[PDB]
Ligand binder design. Structure first.
Ligand SMILES: *[C@@H]1O[C@H](CO)[C@@H](O[C@@H]2O[C@H](CO)[C@@H](O[C@@H]3O[C@H](CO[C@H]4O[C@H](CO)[C@@H](O)[C@H](O)[C@@H]4O)[C@@H](O)[C@H](O)[C@@H]3O)[C@H](O)[C@H]2NC(C)=O)[C@H](O)[C@H]1NC(C)=O
Ligand SMILES: *[C@@H]1O[C@H](CO)[C@@H](O[C@@H]2O[C@H](CO)[C@@H](O[C@@H]3O[C@H](CO[C@H]4O[C@H](CO)[C@@H](O)[C@H](O)[C@@H]4O)[C@@H](O)[C@H](O)[C@@H]3O)[C@H](O)[C@H]2NC(C)=O)[C@H](O)[C@H]1NC(C)=O
Ligand SMILES: *[C@@H]1O[C@H](CO)[C@@H](O[C@@H]2O[C@H](CO)[C@@H](O[C@@H]3O[C@H](CO)[C@@H](O)[C@H](O)[C@@H]3O)[C@H](O)[C@H]2NC(C)=O)[C@H](O)[C@H]1NC(C)=O
Ligand SMILES: *[C@@H]1O[C@H](CO)[C@@H](O[C@@H]2O[C@H](CO)[C@@H](O[C@@H]3O[C@H](CO)[C@@H](O)[C@H](O)[C@@H]3O)[C@H](O)[C@H]2NC(C)=O)[C@H](O)[C@H]1NC(C)=O
Ligand SMILES: *[C@@H]1O[C@H](CO)[C@@H](O[C@@H]2O[C@H](CO)[C@@H](O)[C@H](O)[C@H]2NC(C)=O)[C@H](O)[C@H]1NC(C)=O
Ligand SMILES: *[C@@H]1O[C@H](CO)[C@@H](O[C@@H]2O[C@H](CO)[C@@H](O)[C@H](O)[C@H]2NC(C)=O)[C@H](O)[C@H]1NC(C)=O
Ligand SMILES: *[C@@H]1O[C@H](CO)[C@@H](O[C@@H]2O[C@H](CO)[C@@H](O)[C@H](O)[C@H]2NC(C)=O)[C@H](O)[C@H]1NC(C)=O
Ligand SMILES: *[C@@H]1O[C@H](CO)[C@@H](O[C@@H]2O[C@H](CO)[C@@H](O)[C@H](O)[C@H]2NC(C)=O)[C@H](O)[C@H]1NC(C)=O
Ligand SMILES: *[C@@H]1O[C@H](CO)[C@@H](O[C@@H]2O[C@H](CO)[C@@H](O)[C@H](O)[C@H]2NC(C)=O)[C@H](O)[C@H]1NC(C)=O
Ligand SMILES: COc1cc(Oc2c(OC)cccc2OC)cc(OC)c1O
Ligand SMILES: *[C@@H]1O[C@H](CO)[C@@H](O)[C@H](O)[C@H]1NC(C)=O
Ligand SMILES: *[C@@H]1O[C@H](CO)[C@@H](O)[C@H](O)[C@H]1NC(C)=O
Ligand SMILES: *[C@@H]1O[C@H](CO)[C@@H](O)[C@H](O)[C@H]1NC(C)=O
Ligand SMILES: *[C@@H]1O[C@H](CO)[C@@H](O)[C@H](O)[C@H]1NC(C)=O
Ligand SMILES: *[C@@H]1O[C@H](CO)[C@@H](O)[C@H](O)[C@H]1NC(C)=O
Ligand SMILES: [Cl-]
Ligand SMILES: [Cl-]
Ligand SMILES: [Cu+2]
Ligand SMILES: [Cu+2]
Ligand SMILES: [Cu+2]
Ligand SMILES: [Cu+2]
Ligand SMILES: [Cu+2]
Ligand SMILES: [Cu+2]
Ligand SMILES: [Cu+2]
Ligand SMILES: [Cu+2]
Lengths: 559, 559
């Protein structure tokens, strides 16, 4: 609970807690639990928000998105998930929530848990809100979240700028009429489709029929509004802009940053930005536009102009009349100009590329199916019925090759990872890389070039060491791996657990694009509570009893 | 020679010859020959127009482009080509010149001739200018034209609008620092690169160093100017526009059309447009912008804003100050709104899709090299030392499978061709299809959609017959096959000969994307003069003697 967070002083929170507190090591002790129940159901012939009926969706509590989780910094969040799907298992991952010493609540099926079985299986997740800001949750059972198993998280806390009104969450997502499993199958042998539409806060107009509605955000004239923008897509990467208005970024993913004013923002799959918008213009209706850059390298939609309306209270109704100017093309790249409020510094002039710190991403066309993604020579394929944690609990170190284990034994040390984007392959695509259990530092990437140009870069220390930044670089949970290039990341090994690190494009992680960082496995075993172990075993027993009865095969990585 | 062609009456030409004359069957007898000599040399470490030195170019008469060929309607054009290259053969194709009953002058090596050998080989081409308008010529010896063996053709004649000043030719081309053979090799196993620059009428500024010059066109205030725009690229497809001005199309390729005013034009590789521009704006300097659409599906450049300067005579010098607005995205499609002055009419209701009128294009990834393009199951591969004409002249009908012969015996009849763009492949690209020996009618294509959307269409008579147009449809020599879709063309068998029909993206035809229409072969043999036969055999004898001594292999289709 806050005691001194006001519109003119958003920096403050409570005694000993403010915007400069190192939230990674210090958390308010509130004693409060916010609980939720997620009832997952399978709905056929569901009428979506743009008027088109979908074959099948999988919904939490009967809505397009699950409950908007809301709590205060230091609260505990507890969610009982009840799987009433017909065939699919499920596992809810809390994206952006680092699960400090709570790895078994990460929701990574095949890694930290077996899936919750259908026809009534249940599991209760319980995690501490040790970071404030805007995050989201979604199923990690193959590409199930593309069917509807997705929602938002708002953990309240201090901010790096004053503002008057918190508009709350604003999820933006691609929308397909085909079901997720259909699309996984299709993308195994075909380039992925454009989205049929892009929903903004749950709604959109159909570009063909005009059915549906624009999201409509009412701004209070003269007021400063915090808007929490998310990209909850399966594939599309968005540029966003508001006609005649700037946006001032105050957080990236769940990391507060120094205020940064911009005309447009790029959001990768899984990324979030908290912005402050001043309703300082003439009262009127203004378009909030979703647009695509990078010449389709990171998505497109069959709706040519997905948009929301921002309406000044007391202005006339109807639609905006100013179409605006197109934003700069972001070329499928997130900005590296954001600077966290609470700083980190690491050396970069000692980095040496080696097999054991390099992660070569490659598209392998030689097998079946056609599109298989490999990291360091292997496409990930996890065992839903024998998760990595089962090996840990049984003291078995014979991890299958397909689990793509990268064991990291270093204790609370900075570790450096060079990710290489198929620089020798026939073609390369941008990939939104996402790390569980940690924020990483973005130390640098290959030079910014047009995303579709097929220019390639291999890390060359004689030119590239000088291009790295270890002095409070961007810190977050998702960032772009440039088409044909490389990305250098660091994270500190402060959190024993098995942590996925994967491209967040659904089709690609389905197709194998992940590794699993096994961080300090010796320490992990000691820190698993009897309750967590017992419940892990309970759910695994039920899943293993269920699986033989499933009418459908597993067709992908499981992730 | 014209006798009544004036600025106020461009429709007139001479007695019995005007804009309405069927130029496909009636030609002025002028008795004039315009002759040229093309001396091809190989130049290492050549300074190009943007300040960058290229490893190797292949030039006609020591210049970036060969002679502008200029003649009148009904003149004869004669060109002696002398091949002073070190290793390569050569063969000059006159793109847009239909070569009516002069098939052996078409310059298609492996089809209508053997290549002219290096170290001083020579051959004289002679053709009747039976069409007026703007065309171009280029080597057809693999992708050699990408090294510099390229130039323009202007055959004067009447026009569909009055105008004051003929500004002449304005070729626009992609420009690569890498030589053509290196790019063929690269594109056999890799997606093609963006161009390093785009030259406009021979020049460009370097996007990195600022070296070079903008093309500078001086407009006479209040005057109507004809500008002859061409795309002489190896791969890039261009959108063009002039800030604050419209352009009125008066011809498409070599076909005069009813005046059509537009804000921007899409030019496929090998396409031409004659436009009339009125200098009716405020006297100033205006940008002529080259832009890319279709989400990089039909090319891009590492120069983000290639442009030329249009200067009003009497205005200040220096650079334009208005950046203007981006044109409509043409989505890699030429317009089907053009309507030829001299009409043609064919039935479309009666078309039935059959194997013998369908040309399925496919990318085959299963062989060596990776990218091989096949039409109706076969990647074309010509024999430079045994051209199709050699088979004709020796009465040999055992054409190799790889010559992709489509024999068309119909005498002077309309023939209908459905080209299908790999609708069941994993990934499809737009292709600029070009026919030798004829203009074709563009009867229809699959629905216009975003080029990178990967939406696929298979011809369906129940919906598509109604979407065809046989009432004076666009008529020209090059048009776009839509990504993932289909294109229906028609041509009349009025010209016996062996005629290539191929994608004009150099990398694609090199990789096999062509067929060879063998039109009325019996009539063809009857029509070959003893002079044409003796000279064909002469060059073949020389080429065949040369080839065993060549130090390099043939690594592609030969075309
Ligand atoms: C999780 O639950 C999902 C929802 O029930 C399961 O997805 C189903 O999985 C099966 C088996 O993989 C699919 O069946 C195959 O579908 C293809 C394509 O059929 C569809 O599309 C074509 C072409 O447009 C159309 O003609 C059909 O009407 C379908 O709409 C067929 O060709 C195959 O023969 C086969 O039937 C289902 O399509 C798929 N359903 C959906 C809605 O995604 C999934 O398997 C479950 N996962 C697990 C691990 O239990
Ligand atoms: C027509 O004349 C052309 C001009 O001489 C001939 O083109 C040459 O063809 C040869 C044989 O294929 C090429 O040699 C190959 O080059 C590749 C790639 O080398 C590249 O990379 C190195 C550095 O890594 C660089 O030094 C080069 O410049 C290239 O960029 C090699 O991997 C092969 O082993 C082989 O050497 C020539 O590169 C190519 N030259 C040019 C300028 O294009 C062509 O073969 C002639 N055609 C015929 C049929 O006679
Ligand atoms: C922001 O989003 C808005 C709303 O989607 C966009 O407005 C739309 O702009 C397009 C393109 O200019 C308009 O379509 C055009 O309609 C006219 C008919 O008047 C027609 O000439 C064209 O063929 C074209 O289809 C569309 O009317 C308009 N939508 C609405 C509801 O006003 C706007 O372009 C977006 N701005 C940016 C910078 O992305
Ligand atoms: C038509 O072609 C011209 C000439 O290439 C284009 O003008 C160029 O426009 C770009 C984009 O606005 C300018 O680049 C920008 O410059 C500013 C200021 O230096 C810089 O802050 C940006 O980072 C960016 O580099 C460029 O100055 C300008 N070129 C010149 C010589 O004036 C124009 O955009 C084209 N128009 C269309 C519709 O394509
Ligand atoms: C996003 O859409 C939701 C719809 O759920 C909006 O939340 C509703 O807002 C209206 C008006 O303020 C209230 O009557 C409802 O009680 C709200 N519903 C819920 C479930 O919270 C929300 O305002 C939208 N966000 C923005 C920024 O416009
Ligand atoms: C967006 O929402 C607002 C409600 O906040 C609507 O604004 C009202 O519009 C009506 C007329 O349409 C006016 O009578 C009211 O006075 C407006 N209220 C406020 C608070 O300003 C607006 O119409 C909505 N826009 C759309 C497209 O539905
Ligand atoms: C990627 O795979 C290679 C194997 O090809 C790994 O390289 C080995 O790493 C181990 C452990 O550090 C060393 O003991 C060996 O010397 C390496 N073998 C070779 C052939 O170099 C590499 O560690 C893997 N990288 C990651 C990050 O997982
Ligand atoms: C484009 O060409 C025109 C015509 O040569 C140049 O126009 C001259 O500009 C100078 C000033 O630089 C004047 O003194 C002349 O009187 C102009 N001539 C005419 C006929 O208008 C122009 O400078 C060139 N532009 C560029 C960018 O070099
Ligand atoms: C494409 O290839 C197919 C297969 O070789 C050709 O189809 C044959 O055409 C002949 C002549 O009409 C028929 O007698 C055969 O029945 C066809 N065979 C099959 C398997 O259908 C077809 O003609 C080729 N098309 C073109 C345009 O060259
Ligand atoms: C791996 O699957 C894909 C294939 C694509 O198609 C190709 C392409 O198009 C951009 C260019 C070159 C090769 C491609 O693969 C067949 C494009 C994709 O991007 C959305 C893509 O994800
Ligand atoms: C889940 O929701 C369905 C549909 O509303 C309902 O019938 C069922 O009882 C719910 N089950 C649980 C455990 O909440
Ligand atoms: C250890 O795990 C491997 C791989 O799953 C398995 O085959 C083996 O039997 C396990 N051993 C024990 C003792 O559990
Ligand atoms: C061709 O040009 C070269 C270089 O200019 C010259 O030396 C040579 O003599 C010319 N050959 C002929 C036959 O024109
Ligand atoms: C093109 O360049 C040529 C030669 O450099 C020049 O004579 C001609 O005027 C230019 N054409 C135009 C339209 O500017
Ligand atoms: C046709 O040409 C091939 C290749 O040169 C030859 O082997 C064959 O004998 C020729 N047949 C006839 C009928 O001349
Ligand atoms: Cl996470
Ligand atoms: Cl031609
Ligand atoms: Cu996620
Ligand atoms: Cu996550
Ligand atoms: Cu990816
Ligand atoms: Cu994940
Ligand atoms: Cu050509
Ligand atoms: Cu041609
Ligand atoms: Cu092509
Ligand atoms: Cu050709």
């Amino acid at each position: 609970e806050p005691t001194c967070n006001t519109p003119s002083n958003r920096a403050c929170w409570s005694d000993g807690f403010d915007i400069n507190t190192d939230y990674e090591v210090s958390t308010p002790d509130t004693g409060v639990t916010q609980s939720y129940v997620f009832n997952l159901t399978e709905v056929d012939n569901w009428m979506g928000p743009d008027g088109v009926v979908k074959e099948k969706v999988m919904l939490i509590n009967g809505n397009i998105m699950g409950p908007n989780i809301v709590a205060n910094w230091g609260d505990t969040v507890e969610v009982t998930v009840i799987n009433n799907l017909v065939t699919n298992g499920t596992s809810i991952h809390w994206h952006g929530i680092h699960q400090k010493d709570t790895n078994l609540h990460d929701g990574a099926n095949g890694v930290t848990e077996c899936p919750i079985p259908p026809k009534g299986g249940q599991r209760t997740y319980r995690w501490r809100a040790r970071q404030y800001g805007t995050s989201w949750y979604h199923s990690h059972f193959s590409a199930q979240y593309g069917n509807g198993v997705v929602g938002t998280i708002q953990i309240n806390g201090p901010a790096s700028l004053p503002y008057d009104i918190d508009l709350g969450v604003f999820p933006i997502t691609d929308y397909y009429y085909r079901a997720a499993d259909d699309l996984v199958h299709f993308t195994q042998n075909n380039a992925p489709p454009f989205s049929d539409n892009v929903l903004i806060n749950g709604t959109a107009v159909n570009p063909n029929t005009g059915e549906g509605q624009y999201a409509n955000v009412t701004l209070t004239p003269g007021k400063r509004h915090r808007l929490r923008i998310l990209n909850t897509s399966t594939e599309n990467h968005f540029q966003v802009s508001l006609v005649n208005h700037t946006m001032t970024v105050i957080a990236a993913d769940m990391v507060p940053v120094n205020a940064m004013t911009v005309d447009s923002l790029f959001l990768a799959v899984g990324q979030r930005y908290d912005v402050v918008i001043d309703a300082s213009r003439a009262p009127d209706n203004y378009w909030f536009n979703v647009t695509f850059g990078g010449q389709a390298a990171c998505g497109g939609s069959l709706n040519p102009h997905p948009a929301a309306i921002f309406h000044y209270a007391g202005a006339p109704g109807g639609l905006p009349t100013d179409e605006g100017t197109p934003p700069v093309d972001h070329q499928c790249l997130d900005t590296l100009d954001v600077r966290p409020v609470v700083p980190r510094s690491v050396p970069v002039n000692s980095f040496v590329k080696r097999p054991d710190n390099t992660l070569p991403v490659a598209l392998d066309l030689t097998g079946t199916p056609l599109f298989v993604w490999k990291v360091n020579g292997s496409d990930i394929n996890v065992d839903w019925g024998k998760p990595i944690i089962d090996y840990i609990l049984t003291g078995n170190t014979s991890y299958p090759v397909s689990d793509n284990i990268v064991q990291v034994d270093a204790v609370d040390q900075w570790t450096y990872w060079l990710i290489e984007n198929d620089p020798e392959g026939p073609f390369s695509l941008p990939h939104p890389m996402h790390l569980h259990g940690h924020d990483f530092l973005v130390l640098g990437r290959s030079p910014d070039v047009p995303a579709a140009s097929q220019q390639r870069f291999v890390f060359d220390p004689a030119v590239d060491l000088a291009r790295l930044n270890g002095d409070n670089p961007p810190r977050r949970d998702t960032t772009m791996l440039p088409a044909g290039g490389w990305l250098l990341l660091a994270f500190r090994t402060d959190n024993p657990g098995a942590w996925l690190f994967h491209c967040h494009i659904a089709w690609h992680v389905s197709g194998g694009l992940s590794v699993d960082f096994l961080e300090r496995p010796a320490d992990l075993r000691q820190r698993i509570s009897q309750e967590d172990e017992d419940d892990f075993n309970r759910v695994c027993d039920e899943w293993r009893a269920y699986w033989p009865t499933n009418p459908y095969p597993k067709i992908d990585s499981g992730l």
